[PDB]
Structures are given as structure tokens and as C-alpha cells.
């Protein structure tokens, strides 16, 4: 008859279970550590060449080659050390919203308003970047994609689902359902066996790639979650929402830990990324600014104010040497 | 057919330079020793 | 470092050749598999119109991609779940969005039980009746037109404009007007 | 009444035999003795009421110049305007080329 | 001295060319020719003394040669040469200082604007490219104008050697002046092709603009140089009474005419665009914004000392005006440096 | 079923916030020196200037 | 956790009068815009009324303006809809909608399907 009341009492069960295991907030314990101080990061490189606004970027495993996807219909592979363009990939669909650099460096992926994650080969036998595969099957715009390996890749789309793809066959191996809003971003765990997703329902879900079930669901945000990033230890993650607030969740705790917010910030968060150690929490904002947050004290540690438009994407290298920030001004800035 | 000198507003530097050259020309010149304007003994 | 510089020079010359034809192209968004493309040419001016296909009804996220387009063609079925109020709410949300406050909107408009302000409404002097038009139908047409223009005018923040019309040359002239206004604004004249 | 002129005229002529005979025309050297000759030609005056412009003296001093400084170059500086047929073309052609280049840029604008 | 040296050379050439009713005379200063009966003769005032003004002119009266009473012989009216020379030197020095100060402040503002534009690089576009071109041409023209006004015609001992260096300086000065006003014309042309015409931004080749701004002003400069070397080869070409200057100022006024035509058309388009909805105030606002960019203030006063007063003021403050209007009070640059100065 | 999702979620062995906070603090304090963003890198190991 | 659970609603006489209460929790009620949406049987979602954060800017749909009254009490985080002079066409499931963008004038996707930040609705039969 009415199974919604059972769902509400199960919600009460879950909520009082989380409240029973809440002794002290992360702020109440992180006091013996010294403050991180004023983080003064300066612009080192300004990669020019993109024509339209840049929507996404992804560092390579070498921390030198980075791919950038701008809505002008181009995927430019930059050499951050020399500012040289290694590859310029013209796309069939100019409305790209995400891009992924494979950990092997042999392939690259991108997607957007077209419900297709196109895989481009970079190690051909003749010297030309060609389309190796075009993964189709989604019913919404491609918001984020991340390579599992040279043959597997996970995708998130606006159809409130996520999918695990087999590149060689072009088939969906696993489909992840459960979200009620447009999935905006995903973050692979360091083991690539789990991944979190951020949708437009102020919710975050922890997925199992081999099992295909929703393990945990995290609430606490008030608006659409626009960005998600795993902690370097794989036992926590941060989320960026439209409510002008970043929040840090823990997996084994199943509860929100920290709330990063200030009174003067009334603009939503677009991108989020941790440092190599997770001490600093880099987050891009709707205003033409990037705020550095102390993950253990929730105090703003520094500001990056080089971009002239909204920071659309944020990326930290694997070795934590530099930070790349893409904005709608068709420019990429490498900070250090 | 036209007026004397450069009448346009863009050649104000030319007229000013020529004026400075005419007034402050060769240095070391003498001055008026006798009474010039109202005297009958003015050449 | 030598092959890097040569490949960089090649890529940059290709990017310039692409930039010319990119900035020499008009981009348009049509509202009303994931995306359909339509390219046409008017007076040798390149147009690139995009139609939304196979997308969910929640547009507050993917509509942000069209902030740099020349104009958003908003088609309304002006000819019952009160479709016109829903179209009005959609145009209102588009007009006050912080990312589309500079993007112009080309409004294409293809009894007083849902708008009681229709009885006391008066046909303004700006309303020119088309030839072969009855007073009541023209009054209703301009009534929906001014219902849209009141939302269009109740916002001082933004560079955008609204071009309502009751078909390719109309879009061409509106895009040319938008380009002229943007050039005048870049010179701080308008 | 004014036979005073040869007194210093041929003394000028005698002292003129110092400098080179062909440098008598050279305006750099002999002008010193020329100014001395002017001092002569107006210092013997001022006894009866003579003035500085002496019409009765121009002929004789021109003759004293004729005695020594004949067959000479004039060394004239001339500032001349065009004959009124070369002036206006050199003024018009730049204007026509300016408007033509402006029109050519406006033409290339739409191309 | 050099005064009676000039007088001696004048005596020499006068008795050189004359020896070849009122008759020919020599009043001790100037050589005069024979004039008709009842005719007043004239002679332009010389440069003998530091008290006489050479620009003036002296006269003589015929009738005998107008024997002055109480003198009982010939006399000449040298009054018009030294009555108002002190005031002339006063206004000359004041105008010189005006030009130097104005052009120096113009260089300062234009260099600041150029540094901002070339370092920020976020405003890089064809509009800003032509802006930097116009600013650099302004800088070059004004710098050469200062160096030509101070060294030449003010310290004559430098140009006393009668060299070719002063003539090539005249050539280069006229060339960069033509470049300044032709870059104003190019700014007007680009503004017309963008506002009036439907040309896209970041689409034109801009090579024709470089041509018309730099290479074309050489043609009238070389024409004037050849014409002066052939007919009016005076001392260092510093004279301004010869009509050979219109070879340079001619195309400048034509460029300003075309720029004013573009101003009219673009103000027309702006009024047509703003009439949809007061109009007078913002119309004259846009007009006054575009006036210093197009050099309109030179031809709107076509052709008595207050007029050259204002003429020099505007001609030497135009650089400052364009620099403070298009770079300092510009909303984009304002917001950008306001956002960036929180760093340093 | 949305109810079955809540049943699958309400049957997990949670830990309390104190231990998770200690975990995050220990991971941040045991990897701070190997993070060249908390410390300014001199101009001998930074491949960006 | 946004719940937005609504109270009130029921079978009423034609031309009667009731009021619906929208209990808000899990978000700052003073920072978000509120909306009223209904879904009649056999029809789609329809926007009824809304109110700004301050409570001054007020807009109804034409079929209910002058009849219904939108109001909010930011102290108790509740939204009111004083229903007056009801008609059988008002029979619908009235949902309390809250678009997710705070401090914004644009208010998106409140009348959308599969849309979160909306209550389960209360049946108002009339």
C-alpha cells in the first residue's frame, strides 16, 4: 500500500545510527596540528591556443602531458614543461564537456552534449590521431569519464546513470542506477574498484565496479553537486555544490565530516581536487577565483585570482608538483 | 590661391618651430644702440 | 626539442586556420543522438544551429554550454496544462540565469482563464496590426508578446536582448544586430 | 663738396694689395678692410651735416669696387615656389591616393 | 660681431647686384630697388639685431624719398619691428613649454597604457592591436616632435652647421606625423567596418592597416623631400611660409575628413540602435569619446591667438586623452586590474 | 526498490567519526613533506620555471 | 537532507476554503526561493505560485491569482498557501517545490519530472 512510511522510518534508522557514532567533529580533534599558513601559489604557465571556453582537463600519469577539452571542438594535448602542443584533435561534436587521459598514455577520451564517449588513438602505426572507438548507448549528455585501463572506462551521464564500458567491443558491461538527478562528476578510487558519483540531487553514491550495486549514499548538501574528488587514501572524498559550500565525507564513517563555507562566498563550486597528501582542498568557484581550503581546519588558506572567467575545471598532477586550472576565458593556468 | 603660411590646425608645430627659429636665430647678435622708433636719426 | 618546436608550429598554423573559420561562424541554440547539427549559409555568413535531442527535461546544467552563442532561438507554441505559462517560466529562468544574462534570446512565437489581465489589456502604439487581422486575435498576440517583454525588461543586469517575432533572414538580421551591439559595447559606446 | 672719397678709396686700394688678388671676392677675409673703408667713408663726414645714406657717394664707392672686384660670381641663394602647375599635383596626388587606399581597405574589409 | 657681419655681407651682395622720381637707395641696413612715383615700397624685416622681429616688414615712402622733417633727409620706419618683440618671445616660450609638457605627459600615459596592454595579454584582439599601434605611433610622433622642437629651431648652434641631418630630421618628423594621423584614420576605418559593416571580429587580415599606418606616409614624405630639395632647399627646411607643407598636411586633413565621415555614420548607427525603448546626452557622450580617437578636433576648426592656444592644447593633450579614455577609464581594464591588484 | 536500497544501506558495520578523523589527520601528517605544495619548491626541482 | 514534507489537503466543498502547510528542513529556508506546483489526475505538472526569499516578490498563475495566497514564515521554516473559493478543477496533488540555486533570480526545473528538492505532495480533492 504505502511503502514510503517504511522508507522514512528506515531513514530515521540510518540517521540515528550515524548520530550514535558521532563523538566529536573533525574540527574538535584537529587542534594539536599547526595551521597550514598562507598558501601563496603563483601562476607559472599560461597555455594559450584554445578558442572557446574550456570545460575539462585531465593530467597524465607522467605529470607533464595534459589534455584539455574546450567547446571549440578541439582536444589539445599540451606539454606543460615547454608549453608546446603535442596533438590537436578535431572533434565531430564541438560541445565537449569532459575529457580523460588514459594512464597508459596511448588513448584519450572525451564527451559532452553528444551521448557518446569517443576514444582517440594516439599510438597509431602511421602518425595520425584517429578515432579508435565511439561508445554509444547513453541517453543523456556525457558529464564525466575516467579510464579504468586501456580497454575499460567508466562514464557518467545526465540520464542519472553510470556505465562501465568495454572499449574493444563497445558494449556496456555494467550499468549503475539509483541517482535521481543528472550525474555531474565521478572520481575513481586509488584501487579503481570503487568510485563515487555526484548528481543533481544533493547526493553522492559509492559504487562497486565489479559488483554493480550502490553501497553508500551521502546527504548533507543543499544543492546540486557539481564536482567530486576522492581523498588520496581512498577512504574519504570531497564534494562541491551549488550552495557555495564544500563538504568532506568519509566512507567507513558514513557521515559528513567537515563543512567548508564562509559568509562572503555565495557562488557555487565548479571543480574540486585534493593535494598529494590531502592537507589542502583546492576548489574552483563560480566567481573568477579559486580558494585553497585547509581540509583539517576549514579555514581558507589562499586564493588564486589569475583567471578572468569562472574556473570550470581543476587538476593536480600525480606527483603533486603543479595545479592546472581551466576557465571559461579559453586559458589554462599552471600554479605552483 | 591660398593664404600665407600653413593655415591648417595640424601644422601648429611647424609654425611654432619657424617662429622660434626666426626670433631665436643666430646667437651673439647686437641690440639696438640708438633710439629707433621715434627718432629722426634712424637711417 | 626540435621536433617539438616543428610540431608546435604546424599545430599552431592549423589552429589559426581553424580559428578564422570558427570566429567566422554563427552559433545558435534551438529550444522548444545527443545533439543535432544544422549548418546553413546566408549572404556567405556561416551559421551553425544546434537542436537539443535525447536529453532530459532538467536543463539547468547542460544549458550553460550555450552562454557564448550569438543568440538562443526560443520557440513558443503561442497557438490543457497551460503550456504558455510553462514557456513563460522557462523564458523567465533563462533570462535571469547568471550565465545567460549576456546571451541574447530570439523569441519565436508560433479565454482569460489563465491570465485575467487580458480583459483590461490595451493594444499599445508599438503594436502594428498586420494586414488582414481581426482586433481580438491581434490583441491576444501582442498580449502574449508583452507578457514576454515584461519579463524581458524586469532585469537591469546583463548584456542580453530579446527579439520577438510572430524565417532565416529574421535570425540573420537579429544576429547582425547582436554583433553590432556587442561591438558598440566593446567600445563603451553602448 | 664731397671729394673726400678717394682719400680713403685709393688707400683702400693700396692696402687691398695684401690679400690674394683672386680672393678679393672672398667674403670671408676682405670684409674686415671693407668695414674699415666704411668707417673711412663716414668718419671724414659729420663736419657739415652729411647723413648716413649718401647718394653722392654710391657712385664713387661702386667705382672703387669696380676698380678691384670685377668679373665675379654672385653666390645667390634662391627660394622658389613651383610654377603653379607642379605645385598642386604634388598636393592633390597624395590626397587622391589617401582616399583610394581608404576605399581599398573598406573593400578588403568585406572580403 | 655677427650683426655687422651680416650687414657687411648685405652691403656686398647689394652692391654686387645693383651695379648691374624715387630711385634705388641704401639706408645702411637693407638694399632697395627703384619704385614708381607715388608708390610705397616694402621690405621684410631683417634678422640683424636680437630686438627686431624678422617676421615683420619695413616700408618706404615715395613722392625725393620722403625727407623726414627735423632730419632733412631720407628716413625709414623701423617701428613695426621692435615694438612688440618682447611679447612675441614671451608667447613663443610659453607655447614651447606648453607643447613640451603636454607631449611629455602624453608619452607617460601612453607608455603606461602600452605596458598594461602588452603584459596582461587577456585583451588581445584586433581592436586592442590597432590600439597598441596607434599608441606607439603617438609615442614616436610626440618624442620626435619634442626632440625636433628643442634641438632644432631652439638651439640653432646645432643646426648652424647647415647639415643634411636637420633635413633628414624634418623628413622623419613629417613621416611620423603622417603615421600618427594615418593610424587615427586606420582606427576610424576599423571602427567603421566593425560597427557600420557586418564584419566579424578577429576576422580581418590587418595587413592593410599596417600598410596604411606605416608604409604609406612615406610617399608624401618623399614627395615633399624631393620637391623641397628641387625648389625650396632652404636652411634645414625649417621655413613654414612655403606651400610645400601641404604635401604632408594635405593627406592628413583628408584622412581626418574620412574619419569624420565614419564618425557621422557610426553615430547614426548608434542612434538607430538606441532609439528602441535620454538620446542626446549618451549620443554626445559617444561622440566625445570617439573625438580624441579619430583626431576630429583638428578639422572641426578649419582655416587671433586664442585659437592656436586651444589648438596646441588639444594637439599636445590628445595622447593623454586617448590614454585615459580607452585604457584607464575602460571598464574591462578597470575590472581586470582591480581584480589583479589584490595579489600585487 | 528504494526501500530495499535503504535496507542494504542500514546493514553496514560503521565506525565512529573520531577514528575517521584520526585516520584523515594521520594521513595528512604522514605525507605532508612529500607534498610540494605545502612547501615552496626551490628553483632546482620545480620543472615549471 | 531536503525533505519538504507538506501538510493539509482533503476533500472540501465547492467554493470552500482550506490551507496547506509546507514544512521545510535540511536547508536554510531564508536563502532559497519557494514554489507551489500541482499535478491533476491525467495531466502534467503545473506551476501554481512562488515567493522570493525576502517575501515581497510574489507571483501566481492566472487561474489562482486573487483566490489563493502565498506566504512564508522564515522563522519556523514553513510555507503557507491559503486556499479560498476552490473549484473542482483545483483537484490535484499539490507539491512544495524549491529550486536548488540559492541567491538567484532564475529558478529552474521546479515543474520537472524526476526532479528532487520537492515534496511528495498532498491530495486536495474538490
Check if C156 contacts G (Cβ < 8 Å): no
Contact C126, C141 (CB under 8 A): no
Q: Which of E120, E122, E332 is best to mutate for the A interface (most A CBs within 10 A)?
A: E122
* Burial of F21 (C-beta count, 10 Å sphere; 0-12/13-18/19+): buried
Residue F49 CB neighbours (<10 A):
9
Distance CA C86, CA G48 (A): 11
Q: Are G1 and A222 in contact (CB under 8 A)?
A: no
With contact defined as beta carbons under 8 Å apart, do E180 and E106 qualify? no
Number of domains in chain E: 2
Measured in angstroms, the resolution is 2.3
**C186/E200 CB distance under 8 A:** no
C-alpha torsion E30→E35→E40→E45, nearest 10: -20
Question: How far is CA E133 from each of CA E113, E126, E181, rounded to the nearest angstrom?
Answer: 12, 10, 12
Rounded to whole angstroms, the Cα distance separating E107 from E110 reads 5
Whether A289 contacts E343, CB under 8 Å: no
* Polymer length in residues for chain F: 49
Give the best residue of G116, G118, G120, G121 to mutate against chain A (max A CB count within 10 A).
G116
Contacts of C29 by beta carbon, 8 Å cutoff, 6+ apart:
C49, C50, C52, C66, C69, C71, C72, C73
Residues of chain D in contact with residue E209, where contact means CB-CB under 8 angstroms, are 105
Asked if G40 is an interface residue toward chain A (Cβ–Cβ < 8 A), one would say no
3-class secondary-structure state, position C133: coil
Q: Do C23 and E331 touch (CB under 8 A)?
A: no
Which cell goes with C132? 488582414
Binary contact (D101, E232; C-beta < 8 A):
no
Q: Cell 553602448: give the residue.
A: C190
Residue of F31, F35, F41 to mutate when probing chain A, most A C-beta within 10 A: F35
* Domain with E55 in it: 1-82
CB pairs under 8 A between B and D: 3
**d(C-alpha C122, C-alpha C124), whole Å:** 6
A and C: number of Cβ contacts within 8 A: 93
**Structural domain for F42, as ranges:** 1-49
F26 touches chain A (CB under 8 A): no
Distance from CA of residue C159 to its chain's centroid? 13
Return the CATH number at E206. 1.20.1070.10
Decide the pairing of beta strands A171-177 and A54-59. unpaired
DSSP E77: B
In this complex, which of F1, F32, F49 lies closest to A277 when CB atoms are compared? Answer: F32
Chain mean position to CA C40: 17
Cell, residue F27? 594521513
Who's near B14: CB < 8 A, 6+ residues apart?
B6, E240, E245
* CA distance readout (Å), G26 to A160, A267, G3, G36: 23, 19, 7, 19
For E186, how many CA atoms within 13 A lie in the half-sphere containing its CB? Answer: 30
F6:A39 CB<8 A: no
Separation between Cα atoms, residue E69 and residue E63, nearest integer Å: 14
Do A248 and A257 touch, CB atoms closer than 8 A?
yes
Q: Where do we find the cell 556587442?
A: C182
Backbone region of residue D101 per phi and psi (left: phi > 0; alpha: psi in -120 to 50; beta: other values): alpha
Phi, psi of A84 (to 5 degrees): -80, 145
**What single-letter DSSP state applies at residue A150?**
S
CATH code at A1-336: 2.130.10.10
A222:G101 CB<8 A? no
Residue A79 — φ and ψ, nearest 5°?
Answer: -105, 100
**Which of the residues D30, D45, D102, D110 would you substitute to probe the E interface, choosing the one with the greatest number of E C-beta atoms within 10 Å?**
D102
DSSP string, E11-46: HHHHHHHS---B---B-SS-B---B-TT--EEEE--
- List CB contacts (< 8 A) between F43 and chain A: none
Asked if the Cβ–Cβ distance from A10 to F6 is below 8 Å, we say yes
**β-strand pairing of C25-31 with C45-52:** parallel
Best residue in C114, C153, C160 for a mutation probing chain G (most G CBs within 10 Å): C114
**CB-CB neighbors (< 8 A) of B31 in chain E:** 49-51
- What is E288-312 written as a DSSP string? HHHHHHHTHHHHSS----HHHHHHH
Q: Do E240 and B43 touch (CB under 8 A)?
A: no
Which helix (H) or strand (E) covers residue C45, if one does?
strand C45-52
CATH number at residue F32: 4.10.260.10
Are B and E touching by the rule of 3+ CB pairs within 8 Å? yes
| F40 bridge partner residues | none
Give the C-alpha separation, D72 to D59, whole Å: 19
Contact (CB, 8 A) for C35 and A95: yes
CATH number where E9 lies:
4.10.1240.10
Domain boundary among E34, E65, E82: E82
Taking alpha carbons only, the member of A212, A213, A208, A205 closest to residue A194 is A208
Residue numbers after which chain B is interrupted (C to N above 2.5 A) read: none
Question: Which of G26, G101, G115 lies at the smallest CB-CB distance from A242?
Answer: G101
Q: What share of chain D is helix, strand, coil (3-state, %, to 5)?
A: 55, 0, 45
Question: Is residue C119 within 8 angstroms of chain E, CB to CB?
Answer: no
CA gap A280, D63 in Å, rounded: 108
Mind telling me how many Å the CA of B13 is from chain E's nearest CA?
8
**E211 and E299 share a domain?**
yes
What is the β-pairing status of strands A116-121 and A107-112? antiparallel
* Torsion D69-D73-D78-D80 (CA) sign: positive
From chain A, pick out residues whose CB is under 8 angstroms from the CB of C4.
79, 82, 84, 86
Are residues E55 and E183 located together in one domain of the fold? no
Provide the 10 A C-beta neighbour count for residue E28: 17
DSSP class of F42: P
Tell me, yes or no, whether E102 and E250 share the same domain.
yes
Comparing CA positions, the residue from E312, E323, E319 lying closest to residue E295 is: E319
Helices (H), ranges, chain A: 4-20, 26-29
Neighbour count for residue E101 (Cβ, 10 Å): 12
Pairing state between β A74-79 and A65-70: antiparallel
Q: Which chains have 3+ CB pairs within 8 A of A?
A: C, E, F, G
Closest to E183 measured CA to CA, from E237, E123, E118, E139: E139
Q: Could you give phi then psi for residue E214, rounded to 5 degrees?
A: -115, -50
Spell out the residues 6+ positions from residue E288 whose beta carbon is closer than 8 angstroms to its own. none
How many structural domains compose chain F?
1
Give the whole-angstrom CA distance, residue C156 versus residue G98.
25
Q: What distance in Å separates the CA atoms of residue D83 and residue D91, rounded to the nearest whole number?
A: 14
How far does CA E40 lie from the centroid of its chain?
Answer: 36
Tell if the CB–CB gap between G103 and A266 is shorter than 8 Å. yes
Rounded Cα distance, A150 and A153, in Å: 8
Chain D contact for E162 (CB, 8 A cutoff)? no
User: F-chain residues within 8 Å CB-CB of A6?
Assistant: 3
Q: How many CA atoms lie within 13 A of E84 on its CB side?
A: 7
Cβ-contact A66, A101 below 8 angstroms:
yes
Chains C, E: CB contacts within 8 A come to: 41
Between the alpha carbon of residue C5 and those of residues A38, A47, A90, C1, the distances in Å are 38, 15, 20, 6
**HEC letters along G31-56:** HCCEEEEEECCCCCEEEEEEECCCCC
- Is the separation of the CB atoms in C143 and C136 below 8 Å? no
Helix (H), strand (E) at residue G17: strand G17-23
What is the separation of C-alpha G30 from the centre of its chain, rounded to a whole number of angstroms?
Answer: 16
Alpha-carbon distance A164 to E211, whole Å?
A: 59
Is E19 close to D52, i.e. CB distance below 8 A? no
* E250 contact residues in D (CB cutoff 8 A): 91-92, 94-95
For chain C, domains (ranges, CATH) are 71-186 (3.40.50.300)
Task: Give the span between the Cα atoms of G109 and C56, in whole angstroms.
Answer: 11
Instruction: Give A200 to chain C, closest Cα distance, Å.
Output: 9
- Please name the residue of chain C whose CA is at the shortest distance from the CA of residue A87: C11
In chain B, % helix, strand, coil (3-state, to 5) comes to: 30, 0, 70
Beta carbons of C115 and G43 less than 8 Å apart:
no
How near does any CA of chain B get to the CA of E229, in Å?
Answer: 18
User: Measured between beta carbons, which residues in chain E are less than 8 angstroms from residue D75?
Assistant: 13
The b/e string for C89-116 (b: 16+ C-beta within 10 A; e otherwise) is bbbbbbbbbbbbbebbbbbbbeeeebbe
For cell 501566481, name the residue.
Answer: G60
Other beta carbons within 10 Å of C152: 19
Interchain proximity E149–B20, CB inside 8 Å? yes
C120 near G CB under 8 A: no
Amino acid at each position: 500500500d504505502q511503502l514510503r512510511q517504511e522508507a522514512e522510518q528506515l531513514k530515521n534508522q540510518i540517521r540515528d545510527a550515524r548520530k550514535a557514532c558521532a563523538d566529536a567533529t573533525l574540527s574538535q580533534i584537529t587542534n594539536n596540528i599547526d595551521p597550514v599558513g598562507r598558501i601563496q601559489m603563483r601562476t607559472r604557465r599560461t597555455l594559450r591556443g584554445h578558442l572557446a571556453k574550456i570545460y575539462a582537463m585531465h593530467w597524465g600519469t607522467d605529470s607533464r602531458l595534459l589534455v584539455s577539452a574546450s567547446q571549440d571542438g578541439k582536444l589539445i594535448i599540451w606539454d606543460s614543461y615547454t608549453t608546446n602542443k603535442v596533438h590537436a584533435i578535431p572533434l565531430r561534436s564541438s560541445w565537449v564537456m569532459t575529457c580523460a587521459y588514459a594512464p597508459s598514455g596511448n588513448y584519450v577520451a572525451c564527451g559532452g552534449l553528444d551521448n557518446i564517449c569517443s576514444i582517440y588513438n594516439l599510438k597509431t602505426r602511421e602518425g595520425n590521431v584517429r578515432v579508435s572507438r565511439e561508445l554509444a548507448g547513453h541517453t543523456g549528455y556525457l558529464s564525466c569519464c575516467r579510464f579504468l585501463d586501456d580497454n575499460q572506462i567508466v562514464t557518467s551521464s545526465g540520464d542519472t546513470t553510470c556505465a562501465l564500458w568495454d572499449i574493444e567491443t563497445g558494449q556496456q558491461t555494467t550499468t549503475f542506477t539509483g541517482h535521481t538527478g543528472d550525474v555531474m562528476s565521478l572520481s575513481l578510487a586509488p584501487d579503481t574498484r570503487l568510485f563515487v558519483s555526484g548528481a543533481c540531487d544533493a547526493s553522492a553514491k559509492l559504487w562497486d565496479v565489479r559488483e554493480g550495486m550502490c553501497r553508500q549514499t551521502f546527504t548533507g548538501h543543499e544543492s546540486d553537486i557539481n564536482a567530486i574528488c576522492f581523498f588520496p587514501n581512498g577512504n574519504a572524498f570531497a564534494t562541491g555544490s551549488d550552495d557555495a559550500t564544500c563538504r568532506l565525507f568519509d566512507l567507513r564513517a558514513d557521515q559528513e565530516l567537515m563543512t567548508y563555507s564562509h559568509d562572503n562566498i555565495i557562488c557555487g563550486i565548479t571543480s574540486v581536487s585534493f593535494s598529494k597528501s590531502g592537507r589542502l582542498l583546492l576548489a574552483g568557484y563560480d566567481d573568477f577565483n579559486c580558494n585553497v581550503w585547509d581540509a583539517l581546519k576549514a579555514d581558507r588558506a589562499g586564493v588564486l585570482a589569475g583567471h578572468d572567467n569562472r574556473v570550470s575545471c581543476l587538476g593536480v598532477t600525480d606527483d603533486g608538483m603543479a595545479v592546472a586550472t581551466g576557465s571559461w576565458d579559453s586559458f589554462l593556468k599552471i600554479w605552483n | 590661391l591660398l593664404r600665407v603660411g600653413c593655415v591648417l590646425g595640424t601644422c601648429q608645430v611647424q609654425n611654432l618651430s619657424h617662429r622660434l627659429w626666426q626670433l631665436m636665430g643666430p646667437a651673439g647678435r647686437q641690440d639696438s644702440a640708438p633710439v629707433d622708433p621715434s627718432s629722426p636719426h634712424s637711417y | 626539442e626540435k621536433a617539438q618546436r616543428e610540431a608546435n608550429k604546424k599545430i599552431e598554423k592549423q589552429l589559426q586556420k581553424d580559428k578564422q573559420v570558427y570566429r567566422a561562424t554563427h552559433r545558435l541554440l534551438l529550444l522548444g543522438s545527443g545533439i543535432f547539427e544544422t549548418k546553413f549559409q546566408v549572404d556567405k555568413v556561416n551559421f551553425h544551429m544546434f537542436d537539443v535531442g535525447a536529453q532530459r527535461d532538467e536543463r539547468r546544467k547542460w544549458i550553460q554550454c550555450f552562454n557564448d552563442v550569438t543568440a538562443i532561438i526560443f520557440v513558443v507554441a503561442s497557438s490543457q496544462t497551460n503550456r504558455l505559462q510553462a514557456a513563460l517560466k522557462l523564458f523567465d529562468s533563462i533570462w535571469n540565469n547568471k550565465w545567460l544574462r549576456d546571451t541574447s534570446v530570439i523569441l519565436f512565437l508560433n479565454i482569460e482563464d489563465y491570465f485575467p489581465e487580458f480583459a483590461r489589456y490595451t493594444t499599445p502604439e508599438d503594436a502594428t496590426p498586420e494586414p488582414g487581422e481581426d482586433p481580438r486575435v491581434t490583441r491576444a498576440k501582442y498580449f502574449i508578446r508583452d507578457e514576454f517583454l515584461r519579463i524581458s525588461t524586469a532585469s537591469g543586469d546583463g548584456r542580453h536582448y530579446c527579439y520577438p517575432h510572430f524565417n532565416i533572414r529574421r535570425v540573420f538580421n537579429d544576429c547582425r544586430d547582436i554583433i553590432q551591439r556587442m561591438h558598440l559595447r566593446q567600445y563603451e559606446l553602448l | 663738396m664731397l671729394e673726400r672719397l678717394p682719400l680713403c678709396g685709393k688707400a683702400f686700394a693700396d692696402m687691398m694689395g695684401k690679400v690674394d688678388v683672386w680672393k678679393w671676392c672672398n667674403l670671408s677675409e676682405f670684409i674686415v678692410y671693407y668695414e674699415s673703408f666704411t668707417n673711412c667713408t663716414e668718419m671724414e663726414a659729420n663736419v657739415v651735416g652729411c647723413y648716413w645714406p649718401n647718394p653722392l657717394a654710391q657712385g664713387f664707392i661702386t667705382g672703387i669696387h669696380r676698380q678691384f672686384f670685377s668679373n665675379c660670381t654672385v653666390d645667390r641663394v634662391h627660394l622658389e615656389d613651383p610654377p603653379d602647375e607642379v605645385l598642386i599635383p604634388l598636393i592633390v596626388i597624395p590626397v587622391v591616393l589617401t582616399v583610394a587606399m581608404a576605399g581599398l581597405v573598406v573593400w578588403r574589409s568585406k572580403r | 660681431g655677427v650683426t655687422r657681419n651680416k650687414i657687411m655681407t648685405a652691403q656686398y651682395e647689394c652692391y654686387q647686384k645693383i651695379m648691374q622720381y624715387c630711385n634705388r637707395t641704401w639706408d645702411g641696413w637693407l638694399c632697395w630697388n627703384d619704385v614708381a612715383a607715388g608708390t610705397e615700397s616694402m621690405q621684410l624685416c631683417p634678422d640683424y639685431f636680437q630686438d627686431f622681429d624678422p617676421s615683420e616688414k619695413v616700408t618706404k615712402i615715395c613722392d625725393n624719398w620722403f625727407r623726414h622733417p627735423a632730419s632733412n633727409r631720407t628716413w625709414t620706419n623701423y617701428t613695426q619691428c621692435n615694438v612688440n618683440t618682447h611679447e612675441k618671445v614671451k608667447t613663443a616660450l610659453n607655447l614651447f613649454y606648453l607643447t613640451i609638457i603636454g607631449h611629455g605627459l602624453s608619452i607617460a600615459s601612453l607608455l603606461i597604457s602600452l605596458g598594461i596592454f602588452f603584459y596582461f595579454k587577456s585583451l588581445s584582439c584586433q581592436r586592442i592591436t590597432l590600439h597598441k599601434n596607434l599608441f606607439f605611433s603617438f609615442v614616436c610622433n610626440s618624442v620626435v616632435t619634442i626632440i625636433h622642437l628643442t634641438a632644432v629651431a631652439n638651439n640653432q648652434a646645432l643646426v648652424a652647421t647647415n647639415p643634411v641631418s636637420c633635413k633628414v630630421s624634418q623628413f622623419i618628423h613629417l613621416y611620423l606625423m603622417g603615421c600618427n594621423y594615418f593610424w587615427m584614420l586606420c582606427e576610424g576605418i576599423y571602427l567603421h567596418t566593425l560597427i557600420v559593416v557586418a564584419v566579424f571580429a578577429e576576422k580581418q587580415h590587418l595587413m592593410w592597416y599596417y600598410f596604411l599606418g606605416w608604409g604609406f606616409p612615406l610617399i608624401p614624405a618623399c614627395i615633399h623631400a624631393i620637391a623641397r630639395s628641387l625648389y625650396y632647399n632652404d636652411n634645414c627646411w625649417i621655413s613654414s611660409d612655403t606651400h610645400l607643407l601641404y604635401i604632408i598636411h594635405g593627406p592628413i586633413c583628408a584622412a581626418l575628413l574620412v574619419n569624420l565621415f565614419f564618425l557621422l555614420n557610426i553615430v547614426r548607427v548608434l542612434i538607430t540602435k538606441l532609439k528602441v525603448t535620454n538620446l542626446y546626452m549618451k549620443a554626445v557622450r559617444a561622440t566625445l569619446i570617439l573625438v580624441p580617437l579619430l583626431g576630429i578636433e583638428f578639422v572641426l576648426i578649419p582655416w587671433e591667438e586664442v585659437y592656436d592656444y586651444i589648438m596646441h592644447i588639444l594637439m599636445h593633450f590628445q595622447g593623454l586623452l586617448v590614454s585615459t579614455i580607452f585604457c584607464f577609464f575602460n571598464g574591462e581594464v578597470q575590472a581586470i586590474l582591480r581584480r589583479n591588484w589584490n595579489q600585487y | 526498490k528504494l526501500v530495499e536500497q535503504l535496507k542494504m544501506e542500514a546493514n553496514i558495520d560503521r565506525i565512529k567519526v573520531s577514528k575517521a578523523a584520526a585516520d584523515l589527520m594521520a594521513y595528512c601528517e604522514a605525507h605532508a613533506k612529500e607534498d610540494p605544495l605545502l612547501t615552496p619548491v626551490p628553483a632546482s626541482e620545480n620543472p615549471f620555471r | 537532507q531536503v525533505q519538504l514534507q507538506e501538510s493539509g489537503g482533503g476533500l472540501v466543498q465547492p467554493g470552500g476554503s482550506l490551507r496547506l502547510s509546507c514544512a521545510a528542513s535540511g536547508f536554510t529556508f531564508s536563502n532559497y526561493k519557494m514554489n507551489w506546483v500541482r499535478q491533476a489526475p491525467g495531466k502534467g505538472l503545473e506551476w501554481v505560485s512562488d515567493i522570493s526569499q525576502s517575501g515581497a516578490s510574489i507571483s501566481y498563475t492566472g487561474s489562482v491569482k486573487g483566490r489563493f495566497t502565498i506566504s512564508r514564515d522564515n522563522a519556523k521554516n514553513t510555507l503557507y498557501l491559503q486556499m479560498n473559493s476552490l473549484k473542482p478543477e483545483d483537484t490535484a496533488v499539490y507539491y512544495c517545490a524549491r529550486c536548488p540555486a540559492p541567491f538567484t533570480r532564475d529558478c529552474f526545473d521546479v515543474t520537472s519530472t524526476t526532479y528532487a528538492y520537492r515534496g511528495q505532495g498532498t491530495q486536495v480533492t474538490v
